[PDB]
Amino acid sequence: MTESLVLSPAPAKPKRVKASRRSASHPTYSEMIAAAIRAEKSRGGSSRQSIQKYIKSHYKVGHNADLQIKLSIRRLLAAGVLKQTKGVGASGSFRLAKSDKAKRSPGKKKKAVRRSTSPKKAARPRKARSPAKKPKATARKARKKSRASPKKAKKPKTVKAKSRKASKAK
Amino acid sequence: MTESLVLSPAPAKPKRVKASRRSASHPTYSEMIAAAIRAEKSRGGSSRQSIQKYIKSQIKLSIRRLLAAGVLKQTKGVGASGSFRLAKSDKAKRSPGKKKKAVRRSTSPKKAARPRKARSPAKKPKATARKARKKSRASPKKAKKPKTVKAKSRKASKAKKVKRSKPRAKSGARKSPKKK
Amino acid sequence: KRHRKVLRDNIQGITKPAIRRLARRGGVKRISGLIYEETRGVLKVFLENVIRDAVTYTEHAKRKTVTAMDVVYALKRQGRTLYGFGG
Amino acid sequence: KGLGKGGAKRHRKVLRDNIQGITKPAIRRLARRGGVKRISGLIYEETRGVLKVFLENVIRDAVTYTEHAKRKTVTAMDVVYALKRQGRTLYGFGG
Amino acid sequence: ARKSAPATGGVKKPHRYRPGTVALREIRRYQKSTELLIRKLPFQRLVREIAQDFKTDLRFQSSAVMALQEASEAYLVALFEDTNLCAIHAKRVTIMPKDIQLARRIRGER
Amino acid sequence: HRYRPGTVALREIRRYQKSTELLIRKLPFQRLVREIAQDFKTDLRFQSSAVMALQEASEAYLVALFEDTNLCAIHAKRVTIMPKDIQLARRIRGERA
Amino acid sequence: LAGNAARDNKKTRIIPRHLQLAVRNDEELNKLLGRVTIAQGGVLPNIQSVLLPKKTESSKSAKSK
């Protein structure tokens, strides 16, 4: 039909121009779902809210994208790209389809840092009490007074055992 | 769990250190090769010996573990060694794939082969412009000047629509190959 | 009685570990899912053919119960002979 | 080109060539009759051994049948009896 | 102390009793004893089921069912002998259903 | 001009199937038949019909075997038929008995 | 021959298994009485070499994988 390849692209051309180009400005048309999957970091990406909040940036909108999202996801599970799991409290469970048997019950696995913000609690009785407990996020507490080791820390850092003491004495 | 409880003293007392202030070093058995793959500077993927070089700062079991986790998609080859790459997700279709013979987007030529099937010729998987439906028997040096005459006969609005339409295909031609 | 007429209902639910034990008796170590269905089918086809001679022998003798002797006659006709159940 | 040039043989029979007379083209036609596209180089020697075993089993009964009849000629009736018992019953030789 | 035992919750296993070891243990036992692997009663129901369609007013003796079962079990085992040899010829031990197609075709059965 | 491998085989497949002929040469077969029976019994005579009957059974047995070994090759991924196929076919068919 | 198999089995009585033995071990006694089913006769321990991998119980490649 002419509507799909001649008429409709004409008004959306400026939106697509502002969208992804060779300058790596944005993800492509069929990879926004993959972007949602990698950025979700949860048990399952919600069908509506998560996808909207990860595609909130500037792209082809108003072009009936609220049907085009459905029409695009309607062509993804053919090659085993995405799959779904059951739930009670999630609007959607779109997940990456990979070598986890795709039929596994939820478990537990986490890996983050929380004692990384602990040595300010050691500098408090030792050095100073500048932070006032607010700046605990990643980009915060980077206003210098933020060090953990000697010069070698910026380069590949070492645990600097007793051998490093003799090396420094050298 | 001793493999992760009494061998956990190994990452508790390694002279090399990881997962500290700043991204100085990568966590063990996870996101270790992520930076190396992101800084690929290669076609098709990395190799086992090259990865041995990058890790300098159980490889097969780690690769299988990352496959099970779901972070790796690679390609198949024999002359190329290794072919290691992560999940960049620029285009998941890659249906042509080139190799010396392919079809442009496999849809617009299909949209042109559809009149072939509908009309008298009903050709095998070959697709061309409209004038072949009027004359199936054609030849170069002769089957192109009528197109220029038709373009001259048509209007500036049609010419502008022609300039505007396929730029969609210009944008799409970089999706699947991801590059030149 | 005689309330059962059609043979649509199947009571041929061969047990999976029995197939595994039968397969492992012959030296099998990895059995796929599709193997189980045809394994019953092979048994059904083999049982169907051997029983054709049994009924024909039974009807000739005007019997109501198939004896072990008739089975041996049917079995030895098809090339697979059993010993100890007839003679 | 002239003369044998190598591999020539002018020694027919004389306690030889009985089983080696089934040359490679002869085996090929039998393979092609059953329908093949390509055969390995080892199938030629194996075919001669396979054919001999089948012939040996049949002829063993045939000579036994002939001796019981107290005659020296071996007829098509004796060999077909061996085939019938084995299961490869052959028609067209019933007289 | 503790763990690294046959009890494992979210824990790496020591890679013991790999696929094949259980089979190697079982093949020795089952080939060492004479037994009827198929349960007796379901086979008795099976032989009754099939024979009823061919004719009615038909019963089976206790030895008759046993005679059919032993022949049927031996037929399956003998078939498993040929089909297993098909797998090794194809560099497999998975006895995938392509074996049964070739084994039955070679004999004058199917 | 030059026939690439496999081109003539397909033509020869469609020819031998519809033909009526003996593929084993007559003279070597007579010598083979006499020799194998010579050791079993010394003083023997062979009728022409018996030689013809033996050849037909021997050829048909090999032809039937070739069909099964062809289906043994299709079980694998190789068009070529190796001694692996023939020996396996003999065991399944009961020839090695 | 059946009595010899019983001695190896350490049981005096010829169990139908013992009769199944000495029939398949000898080809000459197998050419006779071949297409038969022995009642309550266990199969011979015929195992293919492919079923035993060995190779340090690890991957064909280097190291234990």
CA distance G2 to chain E (A): 16
C82 touches chain G (CB under 8 A): yes
Domain tally, chain D: 1
- Cβ atoms of D46 and F86 closer than 8 Å: yes
- Cβ atoms of A76 and A82 closer than 8 Å: yes
C58: containing domain:
4-87
- State the greatest distance between any 2 C-alpha atoms of chain A, in Å, as a whole number: 79
Beta strands in B23-154 (DSSP E): none
Chains B and E are in contact, defined as 3 or more C-beta pairs closer than 8 angstroms:
yes
Chains B and F are in contact, defined as 3 or more C-beta pairs closer than 8 angstroms:
no
Question: Cα angle vertex D85, ends D84, D86, to 5°?
Answer: 90
For chain F, count helices (H), then strands (E). Answer: 4, 2
A42 vs A47: CA distance, rounded Å: 13
Q: Give E-chain residues touching B29 at CB under 8 angstroms.
A: none
CB within 8 Å of A12: residues ≥ 6 apart: A60, A63
Which neighbouring-strand residues pair with B86? Answer: B72
Q: Report chain G residues touching chain F, CB-CB < 8 A.
A: 30-31, 34
Q: Return the half-sphere exposure (C-beta side, CA atoms, 13 A cut-off) of residue F22.
A: 15
A75 vs A71: CA distance, rounded Å: 7
Nearest CA in chain E to C32: E96
Q: Which residue has the tokens 């193997």?
A: C35
Q: Which strand (E) or helix (H) includes residue C66?
A: strand C65-66
Question: DSSP state, A170?
Answer: -
Question: DSSP state, A8?
Answer: T
Distances (CA, A) of F61 to B50, D43, D50: 58, 16, 10
CA distance F20 to chain D (A): 10
Which of helix, strand or coil describes residue B72?
strand
CB contact under 8 A, F79 and D83: no
Distances (CA, A) of E67 to A99, E58, E90: 48, 17, 35
- Please give, one letter per residue, the 3-state secondary structure of A78-98: HHCCEECCCCCCCCCCEEECC
Which of helix, strand or coil describes residue B20?
coil
A28 vs A31: CA distance, rounded Å: 5
Q: What are phi and psi of D74, to 5 degrees?
A: -110, 115
Query: Which amino acid, one-letter code, is at G36?
Result: V
Listed as own residue / partner, the contacts of C18-23 with beta carbons closer than 8 Å and 24 or more positions apart are: C18/E37, C18/E38, C18/E39, C21/E26, C21/E30, C21/E37, C22/E37, C22/E38, C22/E73, C22/E76, C22/E77, C22/E80, C23/E80, C23/E95
Question: DSSP state, G57?
Answer: G
Query: Which amino acid, one-letter code, is at C83?
Result: Y
E96 touches chain F (CB under 8 A): no
Nearest CA in chain B to G65: B61
Listed as own residue / partner, the contacts of G51-55 with beta carbons closer than 8 Å and 24 or more positions apart are: G51/C27, G51/C29, G51/E20, G51/E23, G51/E24, G51/E27, G51/E93, G52/E20, G52/E24, G53/E20
Q: Report chain B residues touching chain E, CB-CB < 8 A.
A: 1-5
Q: Give the pairing type, strands F45-46 and D73-74.
A: parallel
3-state helix, strand, coil in chain E (%, to 5): 55, 0, 40
E80 vs C18: CA distance, rounded Å: 14
CB contact under 8 A, C28 and E84: yes
Which of helix, strand or coil describes residue A42?
coil
Question: DSSP state, E100?
Answer: H
Distances (CA, A) of C41 to B176, C54, D1, D31, E76: 48, 20, 65, 34, 11
Dihedral angle, C-alpha C67, C71, C74, C78, nearest 10 °: 180
- Cβ atoms of C42 and E93 closer than 8 Å: no
Radius of gyration of chain F (CA): 17
- Cβ atoms of D61 and F34 closer than 8 Å: no
G65 touches chain B (CB under 8 A): yes
Dihedral angle, C-alpha C16, C18, C21, C22, nearest 10 °: -110
Chains touching E (at least 3 CB pairs under 8 A) are: B, C, F, G
Nearest CA in chain G to E94: G51
Nearest CA in chain E to C39: E76
Determination technique for this PDB entry? cryo-EM
C67 vs C86: CA distance, rounded Å: 9
E30 vs E37: CA distance, rounded Å: 9
Q: Which fold has domain F1-97?
A: Histone, subunit A (1.10.20)
Which of helix, strand or coil describes residue C53?
helix
Question: DSSP state, E16?
Answer: -
- Cβ atoms of G2 and G21 closer than 8 Å: yes
CA distance C6 to chain E (A): 8
The CATH number given to E15-110 is 1.10.20.10
Distances (CA, A) of F13 to F19, F22, F56, F68: 11, 16, 19, 16
Nearest CA in chain B to A163: B15
Q: What is the token pair recorded at F55?
A: 């050849």
Burial of F34 (0-12, 13-18, 19+ CB in 10 A): middle
- Cβ atoms of F91 and F65 closer than 8 Å: no
B94 vs A39: CA distance, rounded Å: 23
Q: Give E-chain residues touching F89 at CB under 8 angstroms.
A: 106
CB contact under 8 A, C84 and G16: yes
Q: Measuring CA to CA, which residue among B1, B47, B4 is closest to residue B28? A: B4
CB within 8 Å of E13: residues ≥ 6 apart: none
Nearest to G41 among E27, E32, E34 (CB): E34
- Cβ atoms of E33 and A131 closer than 8 Å: no
Q: Measuring CA to CA, which residue among A142, F61, D32, C51 is closest to residue E43? A: C51
Nearest CA in chain C to G37: C82
Query: Which amino acid, one-letter code, is at D55?
Result: L
What CATH number should be reported for the domain holding residue C8? 1.10.20.10
- Cβ atoms of A11 and B66 closer than 8 Å: no
E11 touches chain C (CB under 8 A): no
- Please give, one letter per residue, the 3-state secondary structure of F20-38: CCCCCCHHHHHHHHHHHHH
Dihedral angle, C-alpha C51, C55, C60, C64, nearest 10 °: 130
- Cβ atoms of C15 and E43 closer than 8 Å: no
C48 vs C42: CA distance, rounded Å: 10
